[PDB]
Paper text:
In higher plants, algae, and cyanobacteria, the enzyme is a hexadecamer, consisting of eight large subunits and eight small subunits. The large subunits form the core of the enzyme where the catalytic sites are located, while the small subunits play a regulatory role, influencing the enzyme’s activity and stability.
The best resolved 3D class (number 12) was refined to 8.1 Å resolution, enabling the identification of secondary structure elements. To better understand the reconstructed conformational state, we used molecular dynamics flexible fitting (MDFF, detailed in the methods section) to refine the published X-ray coordinates from purified C. reinhardtii Rubisco complexes within our map. Overlaying the class 12 MDFF coordinates with those of PDB 1GK815 resulted in a root-mean-square distance (RMSD) of 2.75 Å. An excellent match is seen at the center of the complex near the 2-fold axis and at the interior-facing parts of the large subunit. The MDFF structure is more extended along the 4-fold axis compared to the 1 GK8 structure, producing mismatches of up to about 4 Å between corresponding helices at the small subunits and nearby large subunit segments. In particular, the large subunit loop 6 (aa 331–338) and C-terminal (aa 461–475) cover the active site in the closed conformation, and both fold outwards and become disordered in the open conformation. Most strikingly, the positions of mobile loops 6 and 46–68 clearly cover the location of the active site, and map density is observed at this position up to high contour values. The N terminus is well accounted for in the map, while the C-terminus density is interrupted in the middle, around Glu468. The MDFF model positioned the end of the C-terminus in contact with the body of the complex within a strong peripheral density, correlating well with the location of the latch site. Class 12, which is in the closed state, is particularly different from the rest of the classes at this position and perhaps constitutes a more stable conformation.
Numbering used by the authors:
A (entry chain J): 46 to 177
B (entry chain O), C (entry chain M), F (entry chain K): 7 to 475
D (entry chain I): 7 to 163
E (entry chain C): 164 to 319
């Protein structure tokens, strides 16, 4: 003990250092997160657009200057305003998953008191690379 | 008198000149609440009034020349005072000052007037500051946090669980490539943010400039090779303001995200100027704090935590340091939770059960984020998460640099424990009682956490409740 | 070890790793002497060693990665410690640090290392700093007084008696033409130097800039019409360092004589940068001091007068404030005389009867001049002159602006009393017993002093001997 | 709502969203008093509410995306209004804004928000500004007179 | 790009929109079809949100809202301020990144402010969009003040 | 006298006023050891005392006006002196000065006082400087190396064998593209660092600016195409300080790694200011040295190697020049090894067998790296490695630009010999006798080294031992 290094695949942020969560675990945690007053949104990102970059610094004269790139996620049609049904979210995750094999799909939510967004579970795509 | 009074020689009774227990405050008035014990023989209203008189006007013999200034509505006023139940000679004094007496948002003038002049008197045995009313027109001429919690959440590009880190030790003198190796491995292992200490910044042989260049190589790859957003809090300490400005400007060239400074152990106006600069250059600013057994713990005899939290937020900072739990800073429920509430939240009235005697009106005041550090890891994560939630910015001192499998499995174990605790918290578990079994289950296959829990099998402390000043 | 130790997990006993009662110091070593009371159940050698360990290296779990740093001669060492006869749990701890651990002349790094980290611990009940050994290579990377006593004596163009003044009051809000009138009349009446308080400088309508223009108009004639060299100590206070620099630079344009600042109530590095600026611009710099009940008076629990005098002179100042006799700052014989001795003089060894535990080697360190202020006048001039001689810089607060015939006869009476005491002192009189009759003899025809001695006929106070904190 | 409202497609009546005749001001609130005559066919409470709505949020079709911002205590409010006893279609409107809506001590932002946006509308025949409540925290972040009357008296000698 | 009108949208709600929801709205509408979007006066700066950080979220969004679409597009920042020092600070920090076209209500603030900026814009080779406001108390003054043709001549 | 002595008209003997052989030095005192021969009829205590008197106070006839200054502990003192064994008229003088006499870290004041005034005297036949005691507080107000050996090892990113290079010749006039080709080829062949000479830098037609652009074009591929860290020492010489600063600042924009300057053949304060700038901009600085027959070789009449090494390090440099073996600079065992020890090392007390008469207090004094150049190659690599180890920075003059197969096989032969010697050193070989057979063993298949050993078949030289001044 102990060889530590992500082999062939990388650590895609929060909840990637633990074994993957199932849809039942995700739905139970969503139902709790909804109960606690957070508002979910379903979002997705291309594989080279979900992994942090600074290449765009080439266009700009003052860098690093807190600037970042390739961490922005695109929203799947609607945020969960009004209806909070987790099976609608699960069908939308499947529809998103069917639409993009090369892009990652993730859930995020916000606390409207300070209007702050939480980036949650789980980084997933049909072509998901090596398990740790 | 509004000016032009021919006062007879001597000193008039302070209870006949600076005491008004029927006073009606203005929205522009500055108020201060103090806990005091007079020397034996002096009436407490004579003492309270004398404190109000000396911090407003001052005298050692008054004649017609004291009639030259406009006194009327412009002089300080002592309001009704009360006894303290814990000690018979202790009283709470309440003093009002108008806006007319102070320069607008002037921190050394306010500090010298309110604390400097007041906390001196030889006929006063002990005096403790309990609260302050800062009117809106002085709050907004102050600047507050440059990039507070509702800014910092969108600026750091990540959030939804606590922010995981570690304090880099030994404090003495670690070589730049071995420091580069340790920082790289713990960030690549799963820490979000790492932190420097004062001696880690600069040493006789080694300049901050070159330590920073090893940080620059390390931070580029400690994002680039991991995908996840991470960084490192540079601590940036210095002897002169020219050196402070040089340290600022050379790191402006690289424009790194969040740094910290201990600058507010250096001086109040140094930190205020930096916060203005940080606002101007769009930074994020972490504020250090120390001197806990000579400032923060001034029992019945000076500074207290709630006034410290108000004073710290009324200079400003985006992150602010904050209990070590054990060792050198606070860890108590009746100390920390008020202190954090006064930093996190806006628009909330005064309450004597929370030791708040005054409300400073609120609305549009940024929040500021506590940074704890964090002397015990794995078994005290349940209580820490249940008490503080998604506050902190937890910079470990035992974790990471205490794991005999090295910095990456150390950081990975701390990261695994945070994610496992956050999964338990996401399921709504009864965390104080479930958390030991959550850790035992997590240890089945994270081997790194199993090693963390064999290595740290003697630490079980939670928090104490009652202040230990 | 110089590095390469494969330590097992845990925290090693500090008495076996940071305690060396056989150690002999180098000329480059920094030493500190502290008075301490541990929490009950804590060994004092564990506490002393733990303080030395935490200010050097620090640990909450040590493994092989703490073996990366070079420990050897580079780490802090706790020397042999002694009991105090004042209490059964009070001890004096002695801790040595090499030059290697701290950045060269770095005041926030030294302050944070020595005071910030150390004075926190929850297993420590109270800790007081008793002395410091500052080695010559850190004394000269410090800057000290820019224009201290051997410079200031030739720069002020006068000397041979004390320097006579007054503190301008009321503190509140005096309009510029009535302030101009009061300052002109008391300087033309006999005072050498007048002083502002923090609020006097700048108020909501009246800017420091316009107050300064009324000072310029008054000061030109308050030397020109009196022949004698005089001036006014401006105070100069500010909320931000940009405001401090603006205050400096606009008064560089008129290049005014001596000013003062509460900058060193603001912060150490602000004052250090200013002292360098004062060294650069050929100024003279007076240093203000306040917070006496929460800094200076910290009994067994923090800062003390001798360490304060060493710390104040190791940032620097040419004049420095100092006892009010009665009221807000000290007046005790066993407090003031040590404090002044550590400011005035050079090349002198340590003595336990004077509370000195360490000698900082001396030769070429300029002196710094105490400024007293001065709540009682006429009858206490004999004792003040007999105790302090031609030290001070005596700024009255009862005298001058307490005389019912106005600022000029007030100042004249204080000037007549200063010259009369100095003539008695020049005649080699038994001043402590003769001085009352010398003052009575003077009153025959100065009417101004006769009125001063009827108005102030009850103030006969001298000094108390033994400290009152 | 503090954010997250799934509004129906269209425009919702301003009198049910930006007009509150029982509102209680804060010490940090910015208020403006206006004398107005609506175009014929427009209710004066619709006009007051529309002025508060256009100076606060604005719309020309609202859907769920207007739910993205934190409306709650952060939006402008039209308080109770009164008739002018000199002309039948003239009214005095009272509009409150929280401190949250404007940049601190910013003269072109305050000017454009209060006068620029407001004094345009094709449904307004005439609109006159009658008074302003400037809260102390905006009065002191305004810079005001540099050397006013109590300074100028001593300065001119 | 030219051969048809320039397609855009005015960003609302005017109140106070948080930076990631603003970033999402701007990215999506530019990537969907728009050429240029515009901010209002309150969208530029708010107590909690600095123009400086709103600009940095615009920079991340605008780079990809050209790069991921393949078509030249941008966003009109509205630039508004309380003092001329604040106006110049707002100018100079966006000169560092030399972004394509912005707008200002500077000419609701003052005539000489806009004249000085137009010279600065000429010098730094930019492009300058000019705001207009106050239509009932300027433009609509029937027989008793300013009119549209004189306004167009004065503006040009 | 502390001041105020009315000395009688005339000259009092220096042996009765400036000679104190019982004196005990302070820790802050500056001490100097000199080897001297007086003119006939001048006592050596008169000469020592007169030197101390003229470097301290000076007189041509003393009267009461010399009484106007404070003399007491403030004047220079001549300590006990000893005979030189080599010559009947030679003596070693020891002279002490207090800290009070010289401005803090003032190099032209100290240089002019100690060397400038002293090394003039008509009645002194010859005077040679033998050692200096620089007290720690003057060592730390001096600036020393900008990026010393303990910084430079981690900054260059490569270490574990000597640093291989070559000195670029012909000095005349070589066109920039043929220079670019030669530099590229020798770096691609295996050199670590190349060096320019004074004429190579700038010529009437060819500007340093355009020579620098060919260095930039070459250097990008001379790292990029080889995968190994390498560079080129620009020499950067100039006629005015404005030109020196222009040469610095234009190459700061592209921030090239390591350069050198003969700035310290130009002027001491020019090099000191540049080293401060180099420290500020985080560079690395190589220092050139020349003038060996008129400075370094000054037999009994001036400068000597150990004082030169102390003086060079007390301005500072990161690398510093050092024997050519043959030709222009030293190659001797009793010259180089002391000189190198005084540059590399710290914390070592005085020994008369090593010519050390005075210890400057050590602890935190940056090291500085010897640069040899290096006229003879292949057969003298064993002896060089055996004498010096992994000091140097060996810049060849015969190697590379002496190989008739061109710059890449020249550099490759030197690189193969460096690695072969380092492998022999790693195997623990008896290198002085084994190295010849190691070179023969290497030659089987490196053809480049076989050609190197046919080309340089007559040079078998080691080093001479004794100083041949």
């Amino acid at each position: 003990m102990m060889v530590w290094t992500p082999v062939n695949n990388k650590m895609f942020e929060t909840f990637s250092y633990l074994p993957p969560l199932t849809d039942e675990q995700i739905a139970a945690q969503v139902d709790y997160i909804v109960a606690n007053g957070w508002i979910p949104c379903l979002e997705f990102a291309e594989a080279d657009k979900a992994y942090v970059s600074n290449e765009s610094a080439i266009r700009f004269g003052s860098v690093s200057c807190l600037y970042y790139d390739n961490r922005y996620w695109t929203m799947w049609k609607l945020p969960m305003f009004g209806c909070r049904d987790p099976m609608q979210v699960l069908r939308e995750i499947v529809a998103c998953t069917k639409a993009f094999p090369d892009a990652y799909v993730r859930l995020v939510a916000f606390d409207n008191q300070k209007q702050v967004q939480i980036m949650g579970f789980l980084v997933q795509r049909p072509k998901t690379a090596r398990d740790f | 008198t509004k000016a032009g009074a021919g006062f007879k020689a001597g000193v008039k009774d302070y209870r006949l000149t600076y005491y008004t227990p029927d006073y009606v405050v203005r929205d522009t008035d500055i108020l201060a609440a103090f806990r005091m014990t007079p020397q034996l023989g002096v009436p407490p209203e004579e003492c309270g009034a004398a404190v109000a008189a000396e911090s407003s006007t001052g005298t050692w013999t008054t004649v017609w020349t004291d009639g030259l200034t406009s006194l009327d509505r412009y002089k300080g006023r002592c309001y009704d005072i009360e006894p303290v139940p814990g000690e018979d000679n202790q009283y709470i004094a309440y003093v009002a000052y108008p806006i007319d007496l102070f320069e607008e948002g002037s921190v050394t003038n306010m500090f010298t007037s309110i604390v400097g002049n007041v906390f001196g008197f030889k006929a006063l045995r002990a005096l403790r500051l309990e609260d302050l009313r800062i009117p809106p027109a002085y709050v907004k001429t102050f600047v507050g946090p440059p990039h507070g919690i509702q800014v910092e959440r969108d600026k750091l590009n990540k959030y939804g669980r606590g922010l995981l880190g570690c304090t880099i030790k030994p404090k003495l003198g670690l070589s730049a490539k071995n420091y580069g190796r340790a920082v790289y491995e713990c960030l690549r292992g799963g820490l979000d943010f790492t932190k420097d200490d004062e001696n880690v910044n600069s040493q006789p042989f080694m300049r901050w400039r070159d330590r920073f260049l090893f940080v620059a190589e390390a931070i580029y790859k400690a994002q680039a090779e991991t995908g996840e957003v991470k960084g490192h809090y540079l601590n940036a300490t210095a002897g002169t303001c020219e050196e402070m400005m040089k340290r600022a400007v050379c790191a402006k060239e690289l424009g790194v995200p969040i740094i910290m400074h201990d600058y507010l152990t250096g001086g109040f106006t140094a930190n205020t100027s930096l916060a203005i600069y940080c606002r101007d250059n769009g930074l994020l600013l972490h504020i250090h704090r120390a001197m806990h057994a000579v400032i923060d713990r001034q029992r019945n005899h000076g500074i207290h935590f709630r006034v410290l939290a108000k004073a710290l937020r009324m200079s400003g900072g985006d992150h602010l340091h904050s209990g070590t739990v054990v060792g050198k800073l606070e860890g108590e429920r009746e100390v920390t939770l008020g202190f954090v509430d006064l930093m996190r939240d806006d628009y909330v009235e005064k309450d004597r059960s929370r030791g708040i005697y005054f409300t400073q009106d609120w609305c549009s005041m940024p929040g500021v984020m506590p940074v704890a550090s964090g002397g015990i890891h794995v078994w005290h994560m349940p209580a820490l998460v249940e008490i503080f939630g998604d506050d902190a910015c937890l910079q470990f001192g035992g974790g990471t640099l205490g794991h005999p499998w090295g910095n990456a499995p150390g950081a990975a174990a701390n990261r695994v424990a945070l994610e496992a605790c956050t999964q338990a918290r996401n399921e709504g578990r009864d965390l104080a009682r479930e958390g030991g079994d959550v850790i035992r289950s997590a240890c089945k296959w994270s081997p790194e956490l199993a090693a963390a829990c064999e290595v740290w099998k003697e630490i079980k402390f939670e928090f104490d409740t009652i202040d230990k000043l």
